[PDB]
Design an enzyme around this catalytic site. Sequence first.
Site, PDB file in Angstrom:
ATOM      1  N   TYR A  87       6.454   5.864  -9.170  1.00 39.40           N
ATOM      2  CA  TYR A  87       5.599   5.789 -10.779  1.00 39.40           C
ATOM      3  C   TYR A  87       6.571   6.296 -12.212  1.00 39.40           C
ATOM      4  O   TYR A  87       6.459   5.992 -13.274  1.00 39.40           O
ATOM      5  CB  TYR A  87       4.790   6.531 -10.524  1.00 39.40           C
ATOM      6  CG  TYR A  87       2.825   5.879 -10.182  1.00 39.40           C
ATOM      7  CD1 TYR A  87       2.297   4.442 -10.917  1.00 39.40           C
ATOM      8  CD2 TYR A  87       3.221   5.823  -8.863  1.00 39.40           C
ATOM      9  CE1 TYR A  87       1.602   3.579 -10.494  1.00 39.40           C
ATOM     10  CE2 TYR A  87       2.210   5.222  -7.880  1.00 39.40           C
ATOM     11  CZ  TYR A  87       1.584   3.938  -8.732  1.00 39.40           C
ATOM     12  OH  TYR A  87       0.827   3.329  -8.482  1.00 39.40           O
TER      13      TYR A  87
ATOM     14  N   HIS B 244      -8.176  -5.758  -7.439  1.00 39.14           N
ATOM     15  CA  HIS B 244      -6.493  -5.318  -7.475  1.00 39.14           C
ATOM     16  C   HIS B 244      -6.042  -5.881  -6.196  1.00 39.14           C
ATOM     17  O   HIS B 244      -4.928  -6.179  -5.991  1.00 39.14           O
ATOM     18  CB  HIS B 244      -6.310  -4.188  -7.845  1.00 39.14           C
ATOM     19  CG  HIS B 244      -4.806  -3.662  -7.417  1.00 39.14           C
ATOM     20  ND1 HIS B 244      -4.129  -4.414  -8.367  1.00 39.14           N
ATOM     21  CD2 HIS B 244      -4.436  -2.994  -6.831  1.00 39.14           C
ATOM     22  CE1 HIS B 244      -2.760  -4.268  -7.816  1.00 39.14           C
ATOM     23  NE2 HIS B 244      -2.643  -3.042  -7.242  1.00 39.14           N
TER      24      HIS B 244
ATOM     25  N   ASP C 175       1.457  -5.647  -6.044  1.00 36.35           N
ATOM     26  CA  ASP C 175       0.972  -4.441  -7.251  1.00 36.35           C
ATOM     27  C   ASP C 175       2.869  -4.404  -7.137  1.00 36.35           C
ATOM     28  O   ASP C 175       3.503  -5.379  -7.560  1.00 36.35           O
ATOM     29  CB  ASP C 175       0.503  -3.746  -6.631  1.00 36.35           C
ATOM     30  CG  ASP C 175       0.234  -2.502  -7.350  1.00 36.35           C
ATOM     31  OD1 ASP C 175       0.975  -1.380  -6.458  1.00 36.35           O
ATOM     32  OD2 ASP C 175      -0.453  -1.445  -7.788  1.00 36.35           O
TER      33      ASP C 175
END
Lengths: 284, 284, 283, 284, 284, 284, 283
Positions: free
Chosen positions: G206, G261, G96
């Site tokens: 983010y 994921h 990730d």
Amino acid sequence: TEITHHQAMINGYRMHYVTAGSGYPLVLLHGWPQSWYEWRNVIPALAEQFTVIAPDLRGLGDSEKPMTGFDKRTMATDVRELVSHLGYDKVGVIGHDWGGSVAFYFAYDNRDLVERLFILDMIPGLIKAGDSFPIPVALMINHIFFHGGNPDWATALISKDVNLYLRRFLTTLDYNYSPNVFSEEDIAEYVRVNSLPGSIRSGCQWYATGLREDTENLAKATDKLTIPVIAWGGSHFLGDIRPAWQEVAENVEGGAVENCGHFVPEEKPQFVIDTALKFFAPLR
Amino acid sequence: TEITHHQAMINGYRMHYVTAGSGYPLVLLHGWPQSWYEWRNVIPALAEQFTVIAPDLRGLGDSEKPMTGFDKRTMATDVRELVSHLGYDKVGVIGHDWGGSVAFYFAYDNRDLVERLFILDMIPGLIKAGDSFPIPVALMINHIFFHGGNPDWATALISKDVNLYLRRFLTTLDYNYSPNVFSEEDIAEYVRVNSLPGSIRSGCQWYATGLREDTENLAKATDKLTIPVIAWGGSHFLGDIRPAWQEVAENVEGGAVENCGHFVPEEKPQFVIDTALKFFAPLR
Amino acid sequence: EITHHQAMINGYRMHYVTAGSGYPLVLLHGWPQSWYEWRNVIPALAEQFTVIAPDLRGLGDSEKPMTGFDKRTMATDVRELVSHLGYDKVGVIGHDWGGSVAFYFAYDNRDLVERLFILDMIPGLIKAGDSFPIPVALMINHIFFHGGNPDWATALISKDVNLYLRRFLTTLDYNYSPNVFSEEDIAEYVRVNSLPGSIRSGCQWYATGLREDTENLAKATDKLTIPVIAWGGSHFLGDIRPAWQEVAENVEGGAVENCGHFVPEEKPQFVIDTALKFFAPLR
Amino acid sequence: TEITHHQAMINGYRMHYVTAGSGYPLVLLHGWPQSWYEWRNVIPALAEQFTVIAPDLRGLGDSEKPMTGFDKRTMATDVRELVSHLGYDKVGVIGHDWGGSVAFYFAYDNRDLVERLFILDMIPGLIKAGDSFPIPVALMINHIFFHGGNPDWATALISKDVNLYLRRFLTTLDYNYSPNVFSEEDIAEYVRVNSLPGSIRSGCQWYATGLREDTENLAKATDKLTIPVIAWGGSHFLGDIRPAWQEVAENVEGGAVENCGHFVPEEKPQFVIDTALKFFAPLR
Amino acid sequence: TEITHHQAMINGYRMHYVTAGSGYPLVLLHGWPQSWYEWRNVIPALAEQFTVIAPDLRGLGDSEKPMTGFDKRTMATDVRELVSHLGYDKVGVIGHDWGGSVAFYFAYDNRDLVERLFILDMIPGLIKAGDSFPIPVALMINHIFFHGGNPDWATALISKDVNLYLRRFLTTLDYNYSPNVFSEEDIAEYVRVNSLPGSIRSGCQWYATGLREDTENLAKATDKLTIPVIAWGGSHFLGDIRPAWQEVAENVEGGAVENCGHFVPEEKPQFVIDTALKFFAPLR
Amino acid sequence: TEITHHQAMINGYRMHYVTAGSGYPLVLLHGWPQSWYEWRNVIPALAEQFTVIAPDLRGLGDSEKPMTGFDKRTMATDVRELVSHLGYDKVGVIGHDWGGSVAFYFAYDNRDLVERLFILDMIPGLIKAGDSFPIPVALMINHIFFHGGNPDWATALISKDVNLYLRRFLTTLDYNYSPNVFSEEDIAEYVRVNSLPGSIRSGCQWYATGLREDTENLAKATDKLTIPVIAWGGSHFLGDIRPAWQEVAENVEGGAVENCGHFVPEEKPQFVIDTALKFFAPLR
Amino acid sequence: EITHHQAMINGYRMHYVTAGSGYPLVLLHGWPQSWYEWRNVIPALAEQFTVIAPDLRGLGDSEKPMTGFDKRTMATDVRELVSHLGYDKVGVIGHDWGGSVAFYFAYDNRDLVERLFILDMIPGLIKAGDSFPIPVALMINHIFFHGGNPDWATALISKDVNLYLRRFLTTLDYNYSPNVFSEEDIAEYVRVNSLPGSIRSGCQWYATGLREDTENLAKATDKLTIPVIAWGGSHFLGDIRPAWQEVAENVEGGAVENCGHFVPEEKPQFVIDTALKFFAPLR
């Protein structure tokens, strides 16, 4: 006759008090769970003929909050320090609820200082050392055992929801004639001061000393007051408290206020105003 | 020799009970804030020699929870109805805490049913109509006034945080010799049952009837039990409870369990096991 | 094997645990802990020593008076405990505020405490008259929070005790490692610090720490003569000998490698080993 | 006299500011935990003779809330960009609390821009790099260590109940002469802006930088101001702050405001009004 | 004999389902407030002999959670698409609670696909349009009016405390013979899936469609099944549910499980295991 | 010009609407997170010359809250049925925010019903199917992806604290020129209707269809409007939206409202009144 | 076997674990996780290599600055850590966001990272000047929630971290199976994400992810020359070969069957088997 907010350093903490008026001084002592605010509808009428002094007692209202000295004899020494700080060696005193017990020690310990004593819905203390509680009295005032029993556990359970808890006293029919003595604004003011960190801790100490050191002080307080005393309770709470005060005082008049609960200054302010102006008139 | 979960329709509600073992029946009656679970370290020893019946009394545990019938006379009729349900017309009984008072009335109201009675850390009732609480006793058990004075208000403050409140009793030094009688899993069991809606309300009805009808019933219970009685308090709670039980029973023995608090079945299970086996042996 | 006990001390119920036999050792915990911080040291000491670990005034499962939280007064509690148990000679181990209490326990009872072991503490926070360097005030910023306005601190901590204790128990500025404590362990400290009064009592430790304690330490000028050892974590106070040298004539110790503040739990074996050798001549 | 609400894009974020009146411009700069709103009772009187400009400083009130630039010199560049955006090349400034430190860097860094500086209950910075806090001073302002020490942790404890926390400051006797400077409406306004996500984070950064970057900037700020300075503290908080301002400025007057706490603009508005109009008169 | 977790895109959402074993397929259809998890003590023993397929039905468990299509006819189409996806054109079905109502539509709407039907403690639908609820039935299943009356309002009240509400069904004596059918770790699994946003909303739509479109469908579902059906209820909930199923099936056997509440698969797994292995035996 | 509250059964749910005034009908369509109440300062003036109709659109305000039909074509069919229930075959429309998108479909689908269209600070839809979001645009309207991505999860996080979340829109400088467009009383009204169960769920469905169905509808909406359109955005939100409306409409006027954010009706009600009174005059 | 450590790295305390011996491999976790996600991989890799698995800036138990959350700056933390442990040459696995940090670590240190293993990530979210198609913006709608108004997202998330993390941890769109994590594993991620600063910091990952990182990825035009393997889960990013071919000359990889994921946790044996083969030349 306008109320001014004040503070002074009294026995190592910041004591909030209000003053109004001029001439001979009357000290108004609130009880639990209140503050000087409970005299707001009495002060203006008295302030036309008297200097009016209304402190927030140790731990409650906006007063700072020590960890000790919540026995009513010690709290009476705060009132003494306050009065002498304002320059007065003679006063009249009105005390409601715990304020009436503080008022009692204030007069008992200072026979040079208190000249007249007006009690509202209170007995000189809860009980004397070595006496018992009849079951119906225990039920009528069960809260003393919850507050004073294990005070840290009471403090936790109350502080979780002060807005709910105070209403057990402020709006119920077993404490008031009318469930509408207090506006939501007025209840919000009592919730504001009891929500200040330490107010609930201090208030449970008022009860905890009330069932311990205060009971030993009451058993030893055999020297009857000689000053004029009046004692008035509410029909719908302690009723005729005149006999109870007759036990610690030679000269006691009073009775019960019709259709009135515990919060006599707020349910029948005109009774307190009129009674007080007549009772204190010889001092002006 | 292993516990089994059961239920029965008793006086209009579903009552939970666990049975184990076989032979002569013993009925074990829990108190507040507990359930059959307080007997879990006792039942497996008693079950080698006895049939063991341990119900959730009215309102508490996983039992259903009506809105009245919480005086110990009425709850004892529940125990009568269950014992009748299970085919028994002669039983032994152990009562801890309020279980004790339920057991007292169960023995008093059924002279031919209850053959022997073992009490742990309880007196036949809190007090008798007409009597008074000494300050020391009022403080020691102050919770009775909180739970029983205004049950709805106490239900509200307790129900906000059952996990917190129960610990006043389960882990404190005034209730237990060791603060470590209960694992977190044990406390979590008693929080589960007391977090069932109605468990706290029922629990406060136990103290509320405790100070009203129960006190009348005790003032009128002067026909003493004739059956053997033993009564063991903990050193660190009620102590030598023998005199309290001699007032209502002709044949009383027992005393204080040393270095043991209120929760005798969990702090000193071996003591309860040995006493019970010896006291009830004559009934095999 | 550890046994749970209570005794009526200076007007409250004091919880304490005991294990072992022979010469008595007293282990004194700090904030925000309890006897439980010695759980992995006691069994090894119990083989050669009587071990006594009380919950000090107001913390753990002990009762929670409203006063007497200055460290001198908490030392009288330990004196009364030790006297209640029949002993007129003891060894003492003190961690965090338990170290400061130890210090007063020794200072005021010169013929009772024979040897003193301090873990990651200084005698008190500061003497009356002295002032905090900025870097120091930032390092232990919590003392001003707890001790400044204790009711307000009590209110803010008590809304989430599980959260607040982790400031101390999992952070890298108090610990070499963030995994010194199991969740079961943090839960025990949350349990005792969620008892009504434990937080109030804890903030009283800090309040007296910045007030009466500072006056008592300023007057504490008669140096201990008994053996003292003082060991701090590399990753907190480290070499605490210089500080103890100021109140004590005979001082050994220094810094534990790759160890934070919580030496009994981060380095149980170091504490066991150092204490068996230090206390050896008293058996 | 009408207050109007505006916004400008200032150093990469939206800054809320209010304006009133006409004539020579006075910039009023608030502190923690407040906003332009602390000037509400001073602005209308100033607005009769001056243009009044009152921004929400970086991260507080309704201004946007960046993650950086909370040192008082950076925040002063914000005030410079606002004054420039509004078209003015000469101003007077009033700074209260942290707004006094920002005022100080605004005057220090723009010696041809700022003509006169009025400080209320602040010192040029909390402390100078290399100096130590006396124990009485650390206890008096203990909140700076809480906010500044570990800001994320303070942010979490404070954001859990903004309404409780701000009252430490707004209603207490050690911050205020009277516990009644603020109505419930006024406190709700401060709770509103400090409940906006980012406000408590931003406020903690004012203190974090206050105890780091700002301490080093103050030590290096060795060029005394030449412009007229007045500095007035409350009797019940910083008191006579002239000496503190005499270290960083050549021409300093002021003193202590009688029976006044920290929140001078709200507790003694008439004092701030009369003092500003006389002090800024020569600029009209 | 090992459970594996899978997902498949079914009618526009991700369906969760578990498989074990090999041979003839049996599909196990859970009800409210549960998941495939209620079959965890049935699946391994059925998997020695059969392919076992246990999905999370629409919106519940870890299946995704559409806004429509909660009528039991539509939810039966998800089970068809799943049996299709896995490549079987013959199955047996076990259906418990609402899973029974789905299982009914699955057999009713696909008559060449479902060979044998086993119902646990359900009736084909809550009611037919046109019919009325007796007061007894209304009180016994009052939850249906809560969930399905105003689903958003039920959703908000339930969602505030999923741990509290599920226990209305999981530990009570009117739903279960024993209040101990579920451990805390098991109730935790049901609280986990019903706390996933959308699980309570979906759940209430099971009930809302249950009192609307399902009632219209059931009134018009009058061509009885031809396939062998067994229907078993718990003695302490629905009991002998043969009459209710004889209405919509020609070939019904079954009755009542002794001392069993609503949750037959977790309270009496072995009964389900032996009844299943015998009933589906002619399909290997 | 008194507003009167009404409801009608519209496409299977109870739709709240207010009416006022007489003459030619104007329909005012609110957006998210609002209700008829955003029009409250415009309605009285328009009501001097028009019949004013302001509904609560499907799922918001006090209207009921179905589980589907939140695409803007479907919500526009609710407005058709309302206008048809009131007995009008010709109407003018004002739409703000999502109201503007609903207005667009109302005019696009009913070429003979809507004579004139006033848009406030909206574009016909968020985006056409097959188009892409530049990074700055995605960031400027980040909430659409929050609300519309996984609506159940957004519903859960928003519904924890609606008072806090609505302030993202109602008091922020990026949505409003002034942070003071709304009193606490106004914010409270929005919190009240968005705290009704179903409201937040419905709001999220507006966004969810907003990025799905509505993008397919908008790609196909290539037959431009022929009726007069005016489109006015806020200087501080979408600005000059004429070009956006010219892609779907032949006859567009308008521009930007000075120093105005997204909430034009509440931030500049006079502009809306003045502009509507001139625009709709030919229809009277 | 796993040792908890810390170091001062670019002005903050970074937590990290190590295990085994020989050639160093660096394992970089993503959001909302920690070193912890590697715990079923570390044992098997520690039989052939030294494994180093830090908690990245602001997550897990690492300290939490206000700035430097762009993936180039978080890669400088990794370079400082490697050099503190004294390795001139490393292998790297990134999952990730750890994958994007790994990318800049590799890009910015051409003679430090010899080989690179990406699990279910793309080099960055998007390049500056580019646009999100609608279905992409919907599949990862969370990036706009966390990165748009970080303070607002922090308030909404922090009210209930246990609920919010389940959006990623137990959902069928993030995981083939809803049972990849025990309650005890979820509790671990809830604990680190419940430390004050963790959510603020995550939201800044983010926020930088949709701003500075988009500029940095546009200017990352110099393809890596080292061997890169890139593997996505069948049920999330799938075949990420093409995306890594845009920034590396030597890329092999594809898609792991019936894997979401969280490849390190749902298919540990796949990560182990693939790591041991890929990094074998480096022993």
